[PDB]
Every structure is written in structure tokens, then in C-alpha cells.
């Protein structure tokens, strides 16, 4: 809380930058694939487990943000 | 059925054409080629022979097909004889049983399905109807409508009929089974009125429906009831047939099959002798002697471990000749150190990879589809699973070796071997990393960097052997000449490579070294010399792949460190169990991703493989891709 | 742009159907009744009075006004793609002009389907005497088929062979051309057509079994020169080996008529995939196909009705 | 927590940034992925439980914002 | 923590650009290539590797960021 020196001041920002930025990347990645994905479900409920698994890898960005937001606070 | 002998089929490369040819010919084996352009034009099989083959196909197929409907199988083995007649005969009764029952079972299911479904509407309509399709004086039109329909159907009916009809309904659920009753002569208008509304006279389609609503209703109780029981029997017989006869089905099947291929083999050789492979018909007397040896190049149908197992498979690709330089075979021992060494982990990385290895080499039934791992049971391709049972052991050894690369790596953290840092800590060994801090870290940076360079050197040595010994002069000229540049490269490099440790054991050495480079590129002329630029690009890539294989590697160990050890705030103690909230979680995620890292060894390798450093592929080019070669 | 508009224009356009039940009635509709049924429907808007030539003519115009309008719009990527479809049938028409031109048969009796090039191009082409000149005319506005025709014409000036070698060569041009988009669905349907054309051609030519490739049009994706060849050798077992391939209703079929039916169903099933395909060409494509499929049944059933011909006579062929 | 020293102004700005950036990314993600689906739905009524699950994935980004903002302010 | 060194700040800024840019780039690279694929999954469980194989090459970028960050560490 309160005043902070230059490290704390720099990190305080970046806790926010981190949370906003990851979300943005995740969304864009999701938009192209997500648009593509749906017809297959209609056809195949059977493959749906495969589909459920299919979307996942870019989404990783958000989780990194919570650990780092946690880490920053305390050098803050 | 040909003249006596068992047909033998082989195909292979040009070298094996010869080795193979000699091996069949001397004993008293017959109708051998390539040994003349087509004296098998004077071994053209008869139409009769083609026919026998044809029969074998009906039988072969019949067994497969019948096995399918029956719901069981058989799989291809090594050929054997029975006589066609015996097999056909064998195939026939069973095919007839299984087939009849399979249909019956299907029918039974349908009987049950419809009858139960229909049971309720026919009953509702019947209860209302008190018999009227019995009568001709009154005619009744049953129809089902939802109450969504009811005011509209009613208006259409009303408009045609007035009050000269009876509209009654008793519900079926979500609608009402309805009757429009009309007098004789009113029938035509009555159907049309429902149709306009969009409803229409409803009963079951076909013969059953026509029966009184009351009668149909009775039948529905009976069919629904009867059918599962009846189904049990038909299914039982079928199951029973599959169970008993499966071996048999297969034996006929195998027998037949061996003929279908065998006969075909004869026909083609008959016809037009093929080429680099080798045919023949080999007697009963001749038959083993030729087969035992094989020299490792063809494909037939008759009638410590860490270093050897995948390495054994590269041996087969050594033997083929079709060009003038050494065959592509080094890859498996190039792979191995890094394969084991990708895992160079710490507490949660390398040292936990074990759990998996004993599961896979062993059998794990823990899994929803994996049971005994020897049996390749999977929601993904089963077939694919069986072959790499061999691999489960070699992977288990990898898992064991990666664990070892945890303590040598861990030298430059903890342990003893080149450093002195505690042989073992007390709390969490690898609490944080020596390597995260720069000096230790730096040594690892420089460490990958060299390794990409090393794979390049091996390639250009091979390149010069290739163009030399294949007499691809343009390529020869290229492999030696390109090496001319290098001394100058080392010159420039040094002032940044040790920074202060070097830079001045060489200098403007480049100015004469660059000339040495280009001399013979220019001797062939080569109207496309600039193109050497791309040969230089690979070097940077080789480096990058190793670097990443390391860095992503290092990252893996460090997630156990921010996942179990130290991170939060400036880095504190209780983070150990604050992170344990996370701690169980990081482990599995980590596992999934490191699999991604090992495709990088191969990515590196792929750089080298199609870069004409002792290779036949060059974006195709007669020979099977390398893709298929290395996998097990 | 403009497939915002196109799919949407199509979304409205898809409504003027003459339902499955239309055709079911028609089995049981006399010609007069068939005609009456038609006059009340969108084909009816091109039907004046009663009579088969009028039904058929009504069909041309009905397809024309809802689809034939479209080739003048050529501007979207998609429009060009659509242009390719139309061009192929038209390619037939062009052949009809070429052949007409060769036998002293006049220009005047060759109806063309809605053309990318106008009447006058055709007229000029006809009027442009040398086979080079006719071909040169079609090229004046631009026509990949013009150039192809020329490409074939460069070696000789033998009309029938030019047409034959051209058809293969053009479908080969098409293979690249369809690839030159992307908007897969047309491409996919077309790919199935390659396979289908190979099957029928091999069929037409079966028992000939010569040098198969002169008749094997390339672009087989489940079919190959040898399968084609085998069928052309008379080996029907190819269709039994072309099972589990995308073309399952052909299995065990031994007649071209039923063959064409199965193929139509397979391809139709592919055409049907488009129903809300965006820039993806499916929604307009499927729509064209609907109009087509409708037309097929109508004309068939019109005759059936006309001649009072059986329900069973049309029964295989007015369903897929 | 209200007015204070040098650190706080920096977290207050970036607290907002966290929310704004994620919101744009989620929206973009919904627009492409969302656009393909309805025809599929038109056919597949069948999918409807699945439909509740399918749309759901980009949207996690917003949730991520509320914890970081709350914990930051509305908790400091 | 606290008041960061004047030096620490120069490197600390640039530390972010590497992680954010590469991470974003990988997700998007994976997304378009990812978008093309889906009929194949359905068709062939065995062929599945090709779309998948496609994704691996971009994967190098993020890892590169970690290497430069590694040399800096203990100065940051």
C-alpha cells in the first residue's frame, strides 16, 4: 500500500498490464479457431470430447497472469 | 490351382534384386525372373487359373464378411493350405447361421422399438374410439395432434364438417390422440380438412396400422414385450457362433487369403515380370532354404538395450543401393544423448517422469481405455498402439536416463562433479537455481549454441562425400568450397565469443577467407550463386533449436521451483505450502508440454535430413520418406 | 465484399421451392394437374397455359431469374467462383456452338444458359470462322476456356478432338482455377464431380480398357487412373473397392442410370452442407443446386405426368 | 485505499486497464466464433446443452478481471 | 522490491516485451493454422499429426525470450 519506490511503482502498473494483455491475446487466438470449430459438433457429438480438448492451448496466457500478479504484490 | 510349388513373394531394391535372384535360382526352383524380359509370356496363366483365384476371392471375402456381421474377426498370418473345396464348405454353414440370426436380431430390435412407441397412441385412440373403423356406417379417422394444433385443426374440420362430425380427444402427453368421426360419404372431406390444417389421419405405417386401433393396441403390447426376449435368443446364437467358430473362421480365412494373394502373385509374374524385386514359384522341396536368409532389403509373404533397439531399425535402410554414396543410417545414435538429456530436470521435472515409465512399460488399467498396455487398448488407433510396445521399454529407459541427467545437471546446482555445491540440501533441494542467476546461466547459454554448429559440420562432410562419390560434381564442388569461408567466421566470432577471452587470435582474416569460399561455386559457373545465403541460414536455426530445447528444458525445471519452491513476494518460506495449493496442479501441466520439447530434437534433425548430406529424399525422389524410417 | 448481401439474397431466394410433396403429388398428378400445380408455383410464373416445352422453358427462365441474373454481378471472389460453375455447363454450350459451327448446323438453334459473355460474343465467335478466330472471339472479353480452347487448337484444327482433349484440359484448368480461390465448398463438390465424371466416363467406355488416361481426367481423390482403368476393363469390383470412400450409394450398382442417381445423392449431400456458409460459398452454392435438383424432378415428372407414365418410372429418380 | 502515496496512483490506473483490455479481447473473440454458430444451431437443436458450454470459453477473461480489481480495490 | 536501481529498471522494461510479444504471436500463429484443420480430425484419427505438426514450429519464440531474460537475471 501507500507510497512505493521505483521497483514497486513499475510493478504496480504491470500487474494490471498483465491481466488485461493476456485476455486480449487469448481472445484473438480464439476468434479464428472458434469460428472454425462449431460445424463438427452438429455433425458429431461423438467427437465432442476431442473438440472439448481441441480449443485449449493459447488460453494458457491468463493463468500466467494470476501467478505473476501474485508475485509482484510483495515487491510492491 | 497351378502346377505344384508354393509361390513366394518378394519385392525390394536393385541390390536385393540380384541377391534374391541368385538365392532362388540354383536349387531347382522354377519360373524365375528378372532373368529374361518375358519368358513368363510363356508362363501366362490359364483363364482357369484366373478362375480358381476368382473362387478364392469369393471364399476369402466371404469369410471376412461373414466374420464381420457375426462381429468377430481373424487377422493375417503366414500362409497355409487346406484345399479350396474344404474351405468353401467350411465357410458356408456358419455364414448362413450368422447371417440369418443377424437379420432376425435387427428385426427384433425394431419390433420392440416401434411397438413400445406406438403402444401409447394406439391405446389412447382405441380408448376413445370404442370401435368405429370396425364400422363402415361410421368411419373414424384417428390422428394425433398437439394442443398447439388443436384450435386450428378444429377450425379446418369445423369449416368442412360443421357439426356433422365428432371431434373427441383423450391425451397422449403433450397432445391428444384425437378422432374425427364421420359418416360414410363424409370421408373424403374429412381427410382433406385435417390435411389443410397440417395434421392428417395417423396410425402406424403399413400392414399393422390398418388393423383396428384396439387391435393394433393389443399387438403393440405384445410385440414390445415379445421382442427383447426373442432378441436375446437371436443374439445368443450369434454370440455363440462367434465364440466357438472364431478360430475356425480365421483359419479358413487365412487359408483363403493366402491363396488370393498367392494366386495374384503368380498372375502378375506370368504376365509381365516386373523389375527390381524378384518373383518365382518355389517348390515344396526348395522353399525354406531360400527364405531363411533375406539380406534385409525386401518385403515378403511366405507361401545394452538403449543403444540397440531403434538403432536396429536403421540397419535395414543401410542395405539398399540405388546410389553411389553411403546410405542414411546415423540418426538413432545422433538422437540418443539429447533424447535422454532433454530431461535434465530437477525435483518435479526429471525425477517425476518415472511414474509414467513403469506404467507404460508395465500395464495400467487405471485408465478408462488402457488396460494391459501390451494389448494397445485406446480410444485412438489401437493398431498404431501395438507396434510401439517395444518403444515402451526404450522410453522407460529414457525415463530412467533423464533422471540421471537430473544429477549431472544438478552438479551446477547442488551435487558434486565439476562443482562443489552441497551434495544434498536439507529442505527442498533446488529451492532456487544457481542457473537462474547469470554466471551459471550464461554457461548454459553458450552450451546449446555450440551444438547446432556441430550438426552442420557433419552435414557438409557428408555433402562432399555425396557429390564426390555420386559424381554430382556441382554438389561435390559445393561441399568442399563452402568450407573455404569458415576460418574468417571464427575470426570475427572470437571478439564477442570470449569478449575478453578472445577476438584477436584472428581479425581481418575474413578478407581472404571469403575469397576461398566462393572459388569453385564459380568454377561450375552456377548462374545462381547468391543462393548459398540460405545454406548459412540453417546454421542459425540449428543453434536456435538446441537453444530452445535447452531453454524450454530449463523452464520446465523452474516450474517445479515456482510451483513447489520459491517465487512469491521477494521469495519466502511459506510459499512452499501456499504454492501447494497450486503444487499438485503444476505437475500434470508440465508433463504434457515437455512432449512438445522432444519434437525439437527431431526438428533439428529435419534440417539435416533433407539437406543432401547422404540422402535420397529431396522433396520426394524415389524412396520412401524419412518420416517413416525413424519412428520406432 | 458482398456475400453479406449474397448469402442474404440467397437466404430470401431459397424460399420459392416446390416442395418434396410437390413431386409426390406429381406422381399422382396427371399432366394437366401437374401443370396446374406448377402454375401455382414459381415455375408457374414462367408458365403460360399448359404443355411440356413450356414447363421446361419455364424451368430455364425460373432458374434464370433467380440465378442467371448473378453472372453479370461478377466482382466478388465468390462471383468468379460461381462463374466457374456456370462456365462449365456453358462450356458444354460452347461445344454445342463449335460442333454446330462445324456441321452446317446453324448458330441459331444453340440455346445458351446465362452467359458471362453476351449473345454477341457467341455470335462473333460463330461468325469468326477459323477455329482460331472462334476461340479468339471468346477471349475478347476474357474466358479461361477461350485460351484453353486455343491451347488445344495450337496443335491442330480438328474440332471433335479439340473438344474432347479440351474437356479434359479444361477440367484440368478448372482444377487449378478452383484451387485459386479459397471458398472450399465449391471446390469439394467439384472434386466429387471429378471422381463422378471418371466413374461415368470409365462406365461409358467400359469394355474398351485401352490406354485409360486419355479418358482418365485427373483430380481423382478416391479414384485413380487404375481404378478408372479397372472399371473400364469391365471390372465392376472397383465400386466395391470404392466403398467406404465418400460415394457409398454407388456400392454394388451396375447401371449408369442408378449410378448417376447415387452420385447425385453423394454430391447433393455435399451440396447440402452449405446452409449458413459465410464467405464460404456453401449457402449460395447449395441454393443453385436446389434449383437444379428441383428442375430435374420437375422435368422428369412433367413427362411422367404428360405421358401418364408410371410413378415407378420416376420413383428412383425423383428422390436421392 | 483512497488518496495515498506514489505506489497507489499506479495501481489505480492499471486496475482499470486490466478490465478494459480483457473486455475488448473477449468481445472480438465472441464476434468471429459467435457468427459461425447459429446456422449450426438451426440444424442442431440437439447441441443446446453443449451450446451453453461452447460460447462460454472466451468469457473467462472477464472473471479474471474482477478478482484482480476486487483484490486491488474493494480490498485495498 | 522497494526502490529499484536505476539500472534494474532499464532491463526490467524490456523483460516484458519479449514475453508478451512472443506469447501473443504464438497463439495467433497456432490459431489460423488451427482453423483450417477440423474435417480431418473427424476423418482420420491417425492423420491427426499434420495440423498438430504445424503448430510446433512457432513454439520456439517464447522460449527465446526466456534465454535473453536468463542472461540479464541478477542484474534485474
Author numbering:
A (entry chain X), D (entry chain W), E (entry chain Y): 5 to 80
B (entry chain N): 1 to 303, 323 to 651
C (entry chain M): 3 to 322
Paper quotes:
The position of the central rotor DF-subunit in the three different states corresponding to each state is in good agreement with the 120° steps taken during the catalytic cycle of V1. Similar densities were also assigned as ADP in the map of state2 and state3 in the nucleotide binding sites, albeit the densities were less obvious in state3. Superimposition of the d-subunit in state of V/A-ATPase reveals that the orientation of the C-terminal helix of the D-subunit is very similar, but a large movement is observed in state3 relative to that of state1 and state2. In state3 of the V/A-ATPase, the two EG stalks slightly pull the V1 region, resulting in a minor tilt of the coiled-coil of the D-subunit relative to the d-subunit. This distortion is due to the asymmetric arrangement of the two EG stalks relative to the three-fold pseudo symmetry in V1, and is likely contributing to the instability of state3 in the V/A-ATPase.
The V/A ATPase from the thermophilic eubacterium Thermus thermophilus (Tth) is one of the best characterized rotary ATPases.
